[PDB]
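[INFO] parsing input record for non-catalytic protein 1
[DEBUG] input buffer:
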Amino acid sequence: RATYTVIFKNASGLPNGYDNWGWGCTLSYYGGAMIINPQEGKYGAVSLKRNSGSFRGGSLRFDMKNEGKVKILVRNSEADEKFEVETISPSDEYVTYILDVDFDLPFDRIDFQDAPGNGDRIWIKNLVHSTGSADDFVDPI
Ligand SMILES: OC[C@H]1O[C@@H](O[C@H]2[C@H](O)[C@@H](O)[C@H](O[C@H]3[C@H](O)[C@@H](O)[C@H](O[C@H]4[C@H](O)[C@@H](O)[C@H](O[C@H]5[C@H](O)[C@@H](O)[C@H](O[C@H]6[C@H](O)[C@@H](O)[C@@H](O)O[C@@H]6CO)O[C@@H]5CO)O[C@@H]4CO)O[C@@H]3CO)O[C@@H]2CO)[C@H](O)[C@@H](O)[C@@H]1O
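[DEBUG] output buffer:
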């Protein structure tokens, strides 16, 4: 049976138990979205750092709208190893994504990066991990 971990639903600030180790951007919160404002030329990203513990495999589910391509990554801090999950095409409307994480190590950071590096904004809501697969994801949101 999959275990679901809600990271944030509607965001009014950083999720409880997380820090932001991102770069090249600032975060703001409005309309229930975590909003990433990347700086042109920086290929900026939010990097949500889980302060206690790690996730293992499974899948990540989130709602996103985004002016440019967004690269999703995860990282293992002990090994300082990053793992690219997917790149997501621009959408002016929120879309729900459920993506398998095939990384062989635990992960404690989740990154959303401005892949083109032009400063395109990113809006995120309803970020949830499951220990199970994307195909098997029963959405608690
Ligand atoms: O929370 C409190 C806690 O803090 C701990 O300290 C934190 C600190 O708060 C936090 O700020 C810090 O965050 C770091 C983070 O750990 C790093 O991983 C991250 O590193 C960035 C880096 O800053 C960027 O410069 C770099 O940018 C890359 C870009 O990612 C890449 O895509 C771009 O690729 C180009 C390439 O250059 C070209 O050649 C060509 O190929 O094109 C590609 C594009 O496709 O290149 C850029 C560089 O030019 O990215 C990395 C990430 O990969 O930086 C942030 C800071 O901004 O983290 C520390 C912890 O380590 C305290 O330790 C603790 O005590 C306290 O409680």
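[INFO] The pocket of ligand 1 is lined by residues 19, 21, 23, 43 (CB under 6 Å).
[INFO] shutting down worker
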